[PDB]
Amino acid sequence: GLFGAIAGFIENGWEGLIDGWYGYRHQNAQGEGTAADYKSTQSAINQITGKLNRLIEKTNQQFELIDNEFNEIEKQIGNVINWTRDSIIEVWSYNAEFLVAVENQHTIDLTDSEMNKLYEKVRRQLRENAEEDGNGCFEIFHQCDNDCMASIRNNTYDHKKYRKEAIQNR
Amino acid sequence: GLFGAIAGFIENGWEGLIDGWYGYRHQNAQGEGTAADYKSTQSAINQITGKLNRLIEKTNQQFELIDNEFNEIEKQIGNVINWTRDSIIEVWSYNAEFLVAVENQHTIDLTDSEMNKLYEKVRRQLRENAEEDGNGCFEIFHQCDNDCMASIRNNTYDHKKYRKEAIQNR
Amino acid sequence: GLFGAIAGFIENGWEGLIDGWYGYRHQNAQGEGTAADYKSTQSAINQITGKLNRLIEKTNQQFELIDNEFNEIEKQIGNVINWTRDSIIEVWSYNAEFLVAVENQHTIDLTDSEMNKLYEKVRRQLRENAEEDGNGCFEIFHQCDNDCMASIRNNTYDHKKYRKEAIQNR
Amino acid sequence: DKICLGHHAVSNGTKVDTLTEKGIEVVNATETVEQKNIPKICSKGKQTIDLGQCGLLGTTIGPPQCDQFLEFSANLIIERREGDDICYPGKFDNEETLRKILRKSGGIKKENMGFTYTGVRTNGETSACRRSRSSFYAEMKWLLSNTDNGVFPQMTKSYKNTKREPALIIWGIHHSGSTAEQTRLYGSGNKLITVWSSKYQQSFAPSPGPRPQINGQSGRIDFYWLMLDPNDTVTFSFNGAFIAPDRASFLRGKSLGIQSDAQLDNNCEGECYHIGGTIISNLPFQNINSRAIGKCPRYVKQKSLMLATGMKNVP
Amino acid sequence: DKICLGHHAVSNGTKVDTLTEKGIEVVNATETVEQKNIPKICSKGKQTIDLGQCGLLGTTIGPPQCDQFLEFSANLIIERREGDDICYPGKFDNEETLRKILRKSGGIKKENMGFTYTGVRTNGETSACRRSRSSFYAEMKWLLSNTDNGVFPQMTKSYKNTKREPALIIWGIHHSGSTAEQTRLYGSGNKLITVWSSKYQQSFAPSPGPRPQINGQSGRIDFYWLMLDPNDTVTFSFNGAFIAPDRASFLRGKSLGIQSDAQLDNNCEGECYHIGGTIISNLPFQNINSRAIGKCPRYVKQKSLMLATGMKNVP
Amino acid sequence: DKICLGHHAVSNGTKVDTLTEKGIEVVNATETVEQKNIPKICSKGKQTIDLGQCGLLGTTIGPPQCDQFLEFSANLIIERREGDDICYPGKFDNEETLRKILRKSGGIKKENMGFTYTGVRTNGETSACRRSRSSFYAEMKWLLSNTDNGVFPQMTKSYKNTKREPALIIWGIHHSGSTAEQTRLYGSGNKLITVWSSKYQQSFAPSPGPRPQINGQSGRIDFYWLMLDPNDTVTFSFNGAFIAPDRASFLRGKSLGIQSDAQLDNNCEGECYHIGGTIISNLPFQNINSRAIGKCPRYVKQKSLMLATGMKNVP
Ligand SMILES: *[C@@H]1O[C@H](CO)[C@@H](O)[C@H](O)[C@H]1NC(C)=O
Ligand SMILES: *[C@@H]1O[C@H](CO)[C@@H](O)[C@H](O)[C@H]1NC(C)=O
Ligand SMILES: *[C@@H]1O[C@H](CO)[C@@H](O)[C@H](O)[C@H]1NC(C)=O
Ligand SMILES: *[C@@H]1O[C@H](CO)[C@@H](O)[C@H](O)[C@H]1NC(C)=O
Ligand SMILES: *[C@@H]1O[C@H](CO)[C@@H](O)[C@H](O)[C@H]1NC(C)=O
Ligand SMILES: *[C@@H]1O[C@H](CO)[C@@H](O)[C@H](O)[C@H]1NC(C)=O
């Protein structure tokens, strides 16, 4: 990816996570839990489904026979047919390979963006109260129980509340 | 956008701003003012104008009549014409839709980059002296009047000068 | 670039650097040295070489003569040939210009990503221990000799070790 | 204590390609290149004619194989490999132009041309075209001298297309398989057939002599055809060696001609046909048949073009 | 106290499409698909000929409608719907190949072929081609027997193209509308016209008998034409039923043939024409006419392809 | 004290283009549009025939220039600008269709058709086709009346293709350069040549009279040809003015015909040819010749398409 998040600064993704596409993994007073993010997952899926809306259909472009399977058309005109049919098949084949290569590049770079997008808006929730690990983890100076974890994920978290004990724990 | 700035972490853009494309909005000792950034605006416009330089012209590719509007050409050759003309119109129509879809994707991702690019170089100007709000706002520990605001926008601002009172105001 | 690193927040790149593609430049107790990063250089080169693997070959698409250089084919069929050959050359020429324009856009945005990717993973190594200059430089609160420099580049660096003197040197 | 961000994965991954790399692994991915055929002609709620042994061109002149279709009416015309347009051996001229016409014809209504003859046999027939007994083409008349060697008299027959639509007119020229026979059927002397509309004008003379036997005839009957504009008039003058029409064809409407080896099925519906059957698929490409027709996906050379529907895959 | 970063917007937004989404709203956006026609032929500072009633092929043989153009000279040739190449009814052979030639001809210079005849009327004419009085084609001679039924004598006329450029040669074959008349004009006996260069060699025989009346002639005169290489020589032998040339055409230079219903305008300039007029536009695509010609934008099926010229739009 | 991140550069930069900008400077960049020609035909380990003066169509009928190739065998056939298919002046009919066939033929095996004649000279020859002494085409027989003006007798010759592959059959029609001469060689009276398979049937009559002199013959011999299906039978009846075959051609296998001005070279190998020689290149495009053939890069109008192989360049 161009955003260097998926198989980049994030060592890798978690084979457990059967709940969504991007998620949270916590370690606190209480022990551990791992839980899926609906918003980042839904944004990626909205945009992957949006590419398949574009492609999965067909344009009304219908064709009739200009040569004959059973009984070969005159040779002069037939060469031109074959060559024109060959030049068109050569061109649609480049066009499909390159559309899909471009769609695959942007599909990956897009998911890599939604990984980074979640990380950054979590980083902003904790303005002073925590500092970046670097393996895509946030180390919190203040202790953060399952109610405090559910508030970052539930996106109700109050930085104002824990800034007191966290900041002074420089 | 892939940079997750426009209609992302920035709640949204300001219907007031008739002055440029990206701007600054301040709240200080003095009250309020909202003012346009020339550099981020000009970089986006340089690159949007650059795409229209590529497209708005035409290649010298001129065509002559190979069939007749008034008086239908022989049927054998005419089918081949129609079918070749249909296969070419099918192909230019995919090529235009996809060029414009790719140009629209990169046009948006490019403006989204220039939003993020301004935010980051402002963040760097205030190295210690302020800490990120998360709605695309910088909360300054030190008070910052219209002369101090004009210096971040005028890009003359001295972090060294206010680091004293701001840093210790942890 | 979309990542705003190359010819952006980095003033510019260093004409000295004959060793690799992205590198480190240090100023310490000892004086100065400038040294190349293998990982960021190798990732960019892996992906530039990967585009030339795609393009540098050819598809098996072979063509035979449907007109005659020495002795002009009948005029009716010949116009159709010329026009079909012209419509195909018009189309491959758009297809090549646009492939290469798209490959050039993504080639640049990709190198711009690998510039930014190195900067961010260096920023994370120094979690508390240094704060961003803004010309793509990290100002370290703690003094950092050639052994300390070789550890950030050698990527063995221990933030835990120097956090003591650096953090308190707010 | 701490919180941690990341993404999902499974080590049952799928390979895709990009501008940058050949065979990146991802979470979910889909085929865009349909390669699953239906070996049926999916014909539901489309008026479908199966010519089988009937030649498509044969519907216009009416060999036995075609007697069920002299006035066929269809949106979907299925030409078969076994299907054969004639009985007394011969070709149609620009046969394929004429096929392309009929394939899109919606079928054909026959209308009487209202020729009738005097001082010629009209009833000339052939074991090549048997129905129950030596017969001939349905729509045609095989004009012969009254007696063996009798002199077929110079003659003209004219037909004005008074209909709003153009009339398909066919006629034949008879290559007796010996100049001996030519003269037995038509009388000696060079035989001439000239045909003309406002705009068309062609001469035909028979080239008697022995071809190879086919359905047991060393002779040959080549068909020629034109499309008579309305208020236009085809004139036939002839000397003998002429196979007259009896009926004009008028095209019915719109249809689609397909060549196919696949059986019918009025249970399934489908928009796209080829020699091997029907392509039903919403995928933008296909690798089944570059010569398929109907409403189809763009055919591509590639066996497989996997499109990413999920992020990069990291175990 | 604080400073704040963001971007502009208006809630008068414009919809565009991307790889990812159908109908994203943005700040500014532009049409790339020109659909605004000029219902004029924008002809400024281009030598422009309007054939109107003159048929393009008619400039080579010279029916009345065409007398103003027997030697026409033009960069831009406008063929009109009303325009008609002949007067005594008939067709040109590969007429459209010949049109494509003339459309690009830059016009035509006429040069004398220097035939003259003896023991034939040369002066044969028709109320079909009237100028003031029964006349004939400008460039042609209608060779007839001296007297009704008189025997048109076998004859040859030869013309060497001694010019640096190839000579356009036309000739006609005369389908008298009755074998009765054929023989009145030419004498009885089969009529033959053979024509040959180094490289070309064709026979033509008339097919007399009654076509439909057109401009009041049941007869027909079909034109045949070849392009005589320099130092090459066309030879005409003939028996009668032959319409001679009098002049060869030589192509002038380069031009462009357009078919159009739109009026001229020497006030505007423009590079791209179609049936409905001129496309002036810098846009890369157009949806006006897939059959347009000149220097044009790629025609596309799409009515509209909106390209983004501003960021995403958020109220 | 501090550490610093950045990228490399040199001020010897290379310009490239993008969606966004015309002439961005970058570190390294490469040409994708091969414009370097090899002015040779790179023929190594490909069976290569150089027709030089031999016309490709000439291998089937055998003028002197072609005597080395009557049975040529090759994967790569080089047609030359100087190369000429005949000796007694004339054309082949659909010559280019026939060329396209032979260009891919793999060469031709000749097989005897086993005609022999009686009461005609068979030995007719011409200073046009000299080997050592007035000769004629290798594969052909020039049938003439036994004596000047003697009456060439009506005649038929038949040849069944009993081989698994279709037989290429040629025959000629002889335009004596005066009706005087026609009758000297063949006798007076109209001359007729009819030819027919199961499926083909055509008449030919000579059009005697004087063409321009070419290799010293005002007369002309036009060749006609068909492709005889196996178990099919070509029949030739004729009166005179007929140039018989003596041998059928059978195609050998697969090959490639190229038109070229470039010398051979069995030292180099190469997959892609044009008038000017061989394109060897792994680049995806080329601007050398839009009419090149073999296994080639897509030809593009652009002189240069520079692809970025390094980052943006900043001094
Ligand atoms: C064109 O290719 C077809 C198969 O699509 C082959 O059977 C045929 O021989 C070729 N036709 C001509 C007229 O070259
Ligand atoms: C091709 O389409 C045209 C309109 O572009 C239509 O009027 C015509 O009938 C078709 N021509 C042939 C020869 O099929
Ligand atoms: C087509 O262009 C060629 C060059 O490729 C030119 O020499 C020729 O005159 C044109 N042919 C026809 C048949 O218009
Ligand atoms: C044909 O002729 C009739 C009268 O003979 C006339 O009224 C009609 O408009 C013409 N029809 C067509 C289709 O040209
Ligand atoms: C034609 O012939 C003349 C003399 O008759 C000769 O000098 C000239 O080069 C030839 N011109 C062309 C255009 O072949
Ligand atoms: C041709 O005929 C022979 C016998 O005459 C027969 O056995 C064979 O199968 C036929 N060959 C072809 C190639 O049709």
DSSP string, E131-181: SSSEE--TTEEE-EESSTT--PPPEEEEEE--SSSPEEEEEEEEE-SSHHH
Cβ <8 Å between D201 and E220: yes
Let me know how many helices (H) and strands (E) chain A has, helices first. Answer: 4, 5
CB F236 within 8 A of CB F193: yes
Å from A164 to nearest chain D CA? 16
**Complete DSSP assignment for E196-254:** E-SS-EEEE----S-PPPBTTBSSEEEEEEEEE-TT-EEEEEESSSEEEESEEEEE-S-
The whole-angstrom separation of Cα D40 and Cα E50 is: 57
- Copy the structure tokens of residue A28: 């606190």
The whole-angstrom separation of Cα E9 and Cα B11 is: 13
CB–CB contacts below 8 A, A to B: 66
Please tell me what DSSP assigns to residue E297: P
The whole-angstrom separation of Cα C22 and Cα A93 is: 37
> Residue D205: how many CA atoms within 13 Å on its side-chain side?
12
CB–CB contacts below 8 A, B to E: 224
Shared-domain flag, residues E257 and E267 = no
CB B48 within 8 A of CB B34: no
The whole-angstrom separation of Cα C48 and Cα C21 is: 12
Question: Closest to B83 (Cβ–Cβ): which among A66, A99, A167?
Answer: A66
**Complete DSSP assignment for chain D:** -EEEEEE---SS-EEEE-SS-EEEEESSEEE-EE---BSEEE-TTS-EEEEEEE-TGGGGT--GGGTT-TT-B-SEEEEEEEEES-SSS--BTTHHHHHHHHHTTTBEEEEE-----SSEE-B--EEEEESSSEE--TTEEE-EESSTT--PPPEEEEEE--SSSPEEEEEEEEE-SSHHHHHHHH-SS---EEEE-SS-EEEE----S-PPPBTTBSSEEEEEEEEE-TT-EEEEEESSSEEEESEEEEE-S--EEEE--SEEESSS--SEEETTEE----SSEE-S-TT-EEE-PEE-S-S--EEE-S-B---
Q: Identity (one letter) of the amino acid at F245?
A: P
- Compute CA distances C60 → C109, D215, F43, whole Å: 32, 46, 19
Residue C76: beta bridge partners?
none
Task: For residue E162, give the ligand 5 atom closest to its CA.
Answer: 1
How far the first Cα of chain F sits from its last, in Å, is: 26
Shared-domain flag, residues F102 and F14 = no
Cβ <8 Å between E20 and A110: yes
Q: Identity (one letter) of the amino acid at A161?
A: K
CB D212 within 8 A of CB F198: yes
Instruction: Taking each helix axis as running N to C, give the angle between helix A75-125 and helix A38-55, from 0 to 180 degrees, rounded to the nearest 10.
Output: 170
Task: For residue C73, give the ligand 3 atom closest to its CA.
Answer: 13
CA C34, C39, C42, C47 torsion-angle sign: negative
- Copy the structure tokens of residue E205: 């025989």
| Closest by Cα among C40, C8, C11 to C24 | C40
Question: Considering only CA atoms, which residue is closest to atom 10 of ligand 3?
Answer: C82
The whole-angstrom separation of Cα D84 and Cα D63 is: 9
Contacts of E213 (CB under 8 A, 6+ apart): none
Task: For residue F231, give the ligand 6 atom closest to its CA.
Answer: 1
Shared-domain flag, residues D67 and D35 = no
The whole-angstrom separation of Cα B142 and Cα B159 is: 11
Q: Assess E243–C contact: CB distance below 8 Å, yes or no.
A: no
With 0-12 CB in 10 A as exposed, 13-18 as middle and 19+ as buried, what is C103?
buried
Kindly report the CATH number assigned to the domain that includes residue F151. Answer: 3.90.209.20
Experimental method: X-ray
- Compute CA distances F189 → A89, A110, D163, F206, whole Å: 56, 87, 48, 11
Q: The domain containing residue E26 runs over which residues?
A: 1-46+263-315
- Copy the structure tokens of residue D203: 């001469």
Name the closest residue on chain A to residue C76, using Cα atoms.
A77
**Complete DSSP assignment for chain F:** -EEEEEE---SS-EEEE-SS-EEEEESSEEE-EE---BSEEE-TTS-EEEEEEE-TGGGGT--GGGTT-TT-B-SEEEEEEEEES-SSS--BTTHHHHHHHHHTTTBEEEEE-----SSEE-B--EEEEESSSEE--TTEEE-EESSTT--PPPEEEEEE--SSSPEEEEEEEEE-SSHHHHHHHH-SS---EEEE-SS-EEEE----S-PPPBTTBSSEEEEEEEEE-TT-EEEEEESSSEEEESEEEEE-S--EEEE--SEEESSS--SEEETTEE----SSEE-S-TT-EEE-PEE-S-S--EEE-S-B---
Residue D140: beta bridge partners?
D245
**The last residue of a domain, from among E241, E262, E283:** E262
The binding-site residues of ligand 2, defined as CB within 6 angstroms of any ligand atom, are B 72, 75, 78-79, 82
CB B123 within 8 A of CB B132: yes
Structure-token match 């909205």, residue found? A46
| Closest by Cα among C128, C149, C123 to C35 | C149
Q: What are phi and psi of B13, to 5 degrees?
A: -95, 160
Shared-domain flag, residues D212 and D294 = no
Domains of chain A by start residue, with CATH: 1-170 (3.90.20.10)
| Closest by Cα among E14, F189, C41, A69 to B108 | E14
Look at chain B and count its residues.
170
**The last residue of a domain, from among D238, D262, D286:** D262
- Compute CA distances A44 → A50, B104, C22, D308, whole Å: 10, 18, 31, 12
Question: Closest to C105 (Cβ–Cβ): which among F8, F20, F99?
Answer: F20
B90: helix, strand or coil: helix
B17: helix, strand or coil: coil
Question: Considering only CA atoms, which residue is closest to atom 8 of ligand 6?
Answer: F231
Å from B38 to nearest chain F CA? 19
Q: What are phi and psi of E90, to 5 degrees?
A: 170, 175
Shared-domain flag, residues F226 and F94 = yes
Residue D135: beta bridge partners?
D126
- Compute CA distances C156 → C148, C161, D42, E84, E220, whole Å: 9, 12, 67, 90, 99
- Copy the structure tokens of residue F312: 């943006």
CB A28 within 8 A of CB D2: yes
Q: Which residues of F touch B50 (CB under 8 A)?
A: 20-22
The whole-angstrom separation of Cα C86 and Cα B59 is: 13
Shared-domain flag, residues D79 and D200 = yes
| Closest by Cα among C4, C3, C5, C40 to C21 | C40
How far the first Cα of chain D sits from its last, in Å, is: 26
The whole-angstrom separation of Cα C5 and Cα C114 is: 9
Å from A16 to nearest chain B CA? 27
Shared-domain flag, residues D117 and D74 = yes
- Residue F295, Cα to own-chain centre: how many angstroms? 19
Q: What are phi and psi of C45, to 5 degrees?
A: -70, -45
Which of F231, F233, F250 to probe ligand 6 with, by most ligand atoms within 8 A of CB?
A: F231
Cβ <8 Å between F101 and A75: yes
Question: Considering only CA atoms, which residue is closest to atom 10 of ligand 4?
Answer: D231
The whole-angstrom separation of Cα E288 and Cα E35 is: 5
CB E20 within 8 A of CB A51: yes
- Compute CA distances B105 → A68, B2, B99, D155, E18, whole Å: 44, 9, 10, 75, 5
The number of folded domains in chain D is 2
Contacts of C26 (CB under 8 A, 6+ apart): C32, C33, C34, C144, C146, C149, F2, F3, F4
Kindly report the CATH number assigned to the domain that includes residue F32. Answer: 2.10.77.10
**The last residue of a domain, from among D240, D262, D284:** D262
Shared-domain flag, residues E256 and E148 = yes
Q: What are phi and psi of F104, to 5 degrees?
A: -115, 10
Let me know how many helices (H) and strands (E) chain E has, helices first. Answer: 2, 30
Q: How many CB atoms lie within 10 A of CB A86?
A: 15
Q: What are phi and psi of B104, to 5 degrees?
A: -65, -45
The whole-angstrom separation of Cα B15 and Cα E313 is: 10
Question: Closest to D315 (Cβ–Cβ): which among A12, A104, A108?
Answer: A12
The whole-angstrom separation of Cα C86 and Cα C88 is: 5
Shared-domain flag, residues F206 and F305 = no
Residue D285: beta bridge partners?
D33, D298
- Compute CA distances E260 → A76, E40, E82, E84, E265, whole Å: 32, 9, 10, 14, 13
Shared-domain flag, residues E294 and E157 = no
Shared-domain flag, residues E80 and E159 = yes
> Residue C2: how many CA atoms within 13 Å on its side-chain side?
30
Q: What are phi and psi of B62, to 5 degrees?
A: -105, 145
| Closest by Cα among F55, F59, F62, F53 to F82 | F53
Question: Closest to F5 (Cβ–Cβ): which among C21, C24, C48?
Answer: C24
Shared-domain flag, residues D280 and D157 = no
- Copy the structure tokens of residue F310: 């390094």
The whole-angstrom separation of Cα A5 and Cα A122 is: 15
The phi-psi region of residue D207 (left if phi > 0; otherwise alpha if psi is between -120 and 50; otherwise beta) is beta
Ligand located closest to E232 CA: 5
Structure-token match 């002015």, residue found? F39
Å from B1 to nearest chain A CA? 9
Q: Which residues of D touch A64 (CB under 8 A)?
A: 100, 103-104, 256-257, 293
Which of D227, D229, D231 to probe ligand 4 with, by most ligand atoms within 8 A of CB?
A: D231
The whole-angstrom separation of Cα D222 and Cα D167 is: 20
Please tell me what DSSP assigns to residue A1: -
Which of E231, E232, E233, E250 to probe ligand 5 with, by most ligand atoms within 8 A of CB?
A: E231
The phi-psi region of residue A135 (left if phi > 0; otherwise alpha if psi is between -120 and 50; otherwise beta) is alpha
- Residue A91, Cα to own-chain centre: how many angstroms? 30
- Copy the structure tokens of residue A37: 């993010």
CB D296 within 8 A of CB D272: yes
Q: Which residues of C touch F82 (CB under 8 A)?
A: none
